[PDB]
Design a protein around this nucleic acid. Structure first.
Length: 46
DNA sequence: GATCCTCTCGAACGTTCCATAGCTTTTATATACGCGCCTTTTTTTTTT
């Protein structure tokens, strides 16, 4: 259900922006299953 | 001692442990300008 089951190792933020590095996880997205080897997530907190 | 004159140079020691203040903790930001190091960019390379 759009749930990222992984392990984070690096999250860097510069006052407005995320830089999250996720590794060796399984993601299930809307009747689809996906597993990655690396994940680089950069969110934006308002 | 050992002449004479010019003239040049630089209970103390441990032992325990409270008591002072700090420090360092993140995190806002302006600048330059440092490495840092990602990633793709970009090649060089190997095989078919």
């Amino acid at each position: 259900e759009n749930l990222m089951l992984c392990l984070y190792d690096k999250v860097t933020r510069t006052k407005a922006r995320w830089k999250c590095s996720l590794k060796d996880g399984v993601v299930t997205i809307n009747r689809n299953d996906y597993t990655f080897q690396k994940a680089q997530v950069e969110a934006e907190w308002v």
